[PDB]
């Protein structure tokens, strides 16, 4: 697991987090 | 090492810088601040020479983890743009204790929180910044630490005699720091060579007479290149790191008067958000330009930065604590050519002046509006300003007198001192502000007594630490980023409970002051054309969407960097 693998995985999970945040914002 | 900058050509750079700063200040002297200056000034107020010195030293001794602190600011800055500043604008508040007066009523809570924020400023800011500038001067020049503080504050008094000036400060500081980072990284041979050579900085002198220090005491940590360190044995443990630093950063950014005061002067909400984004992007840098340069200083000056013999550390810095805090200065002084050395001295002074002038103005505002106005209800504007000036003078005096306690302060790591003191004295403020903005039920007696309990615990631990400098491990053995979480939880629960015991503060006093009631108009009744514009937070849909996307991308970058550095 190279450091940029970790960076990309973190970007992916955080992007999912922000997408869920905006989904709840639209729903709530 | 101290005679390096004496060259006339090098000091030509500092005189040119000072002339430029004076010109910009006079031009500004001779609410439409806009996004790029808002963000530039936020960064310049946050990032003082205290950050340079402390972050570099803690990076040398402990490694990259300390830099992660700055990155957390990014996320909190986003909050400041989209959660707290809109409420401060809607409430039409100038100071934060004034916001608490409007929110809770009564005079005691306003006065107390103003005094507490003033004490926080004194210790953490107005001691760390002046101390770091004094380190810079003393290593650069033969002047003593106290004389260095005197000269630095004289220069700052000249400097004040803001957001545009702070924009110049931050631009100059960023360019110079990038130059130093590149130069030092090339000298060490790149990032790969830097990492390879960093796990070899063991000083040759490691024994004093018959006493040999522990191996872990002087060798660089095996996890020096990981932000997330062991929860129990590793300094700055990752759970404490994340949670305690987030609480402390929440306080500093979204509740401290300096940041919010500079964020409030925006033309409109869109430029508030833009300033937040620019400040965050600039705050993405301080790691690569403060921490890694300090580690490089350790690599190149192992015997000076990694000293563990009290005699050697005392002879190098006059302190038997480790000489950790002189990482960045040495790099600036011993590794910088004459012109670039002068430029980096100017960079350090630029950041310090931005931070210190911002804090002086904010403290003047706090004492001027929240205490002196109350003592003298019929105070004239001229007398009001005179009181503010005398207050900043007394603040400076107290901070200078307090400097000596900062010297040892957990083995000389200045940033550790800053974060520990502010962890003792900030979690109560963060708890009250989070509850007030997000919880309607909280009331003045409950908030005041929760704050008093939190301050009692914080001062108890602070006095114990200062007395012991054998301290009981059951109290002080826990790292201060965990005492921050404990104090935050205690103050939070105390406020919640004692508020549920006493009064609801009906509901008509909380319009546009609480998150749930941020949008209600309903003819708010206070507990105590131009105004319509001042309390306006409307933003054009195009710019609002652009800045929302910009913030999402900035936090994505922050998370990426955190994960890249483990
Ligand atoms: O005192 C707490 C503050 O310390 C500064 O040095 C950091 O840059 C901030 O992120 C933090 F909020």
Author numbering:
A (entry chain B): 27 to 54
B (entry chain A): 19 to 48, 63 to 193, 200 to 507, 516 to 574, 627 to 664
Q: Paper's wording?
A:
The uptake of glucose against its concentration gradient is mediated by the sodium-dependent glucose cotransporters (SGLT). These transporters utilize the electrochemical gradient to drive the uphill transport of glucose and play essential roles in human health. SGLT1 (SLC5A1) and SGLT2 (SLC5A2) are two important subtypes of this family, and their physiological functions are well-documented. Pioneering structural work on the bacterial homolog vSGLT from Vibrio parahaemolyticus revealed that SGLT proteins have 14 transmembrane helices, which assemble into a LeuT-like fold.
We adopted the “three-joint-tethering” strategy to generate the fully functional hSGLT1GFP-MAP17nb protein for structural studies. It was reported that replacing the equatorial hydroxyl group at the 4-position of glucose with a fluorine atom yielded a glucose analogue, 4-deoxy-4-fluoro-d-glucose (4D4FDG), with an enhanced affinity for SGLT1 (K0.5 is 0.07 mM) compared with glucose (K0.5 is 0.5 mM). Therefore, to obtain the structure of hSGLT1 in the substrate-bound state, we supplemented the hSGLT1GFP-MAP17nb protein with 4D4FDG throughout the purification, the nanodisc reconstitution, and the cryo-EM sample preparation. Single particle analysis yielded a reconstruction of the hSGLT1-4D4FDG complex at 3.26 Å resolution. A ligand density was found at the sugar-binding pocket of hSGLT1. The surface representation of the hSGLT1-4D4FDG complex shows the substrate-binding site is occluded to both the extracellular and intracellular solvent. 4D4FDG is caged inside a cavity surrounded by TM1, TM2, TM3, TM6, TM7, and TM10. Above the sugar-binding site, I98 and F101 on TM2, M283 on TM6, and F453 and Q457 on TM10 block the substrate entry pathway from the extracellular solution. Below the sugar-binding site, N78 on TM1, Y290 and W291 on TM6 form the first layer of insulation. S77 on TM1, V296 on TM6, and S396 on TM8 form the second layer of insulation. In the extracellular vestibule, F453 moves 3.8 Å inwardly due to the rotation of TM10a and forms hydrophobic interactions with I98 and F101 on TM2 to close the extracellular gate.
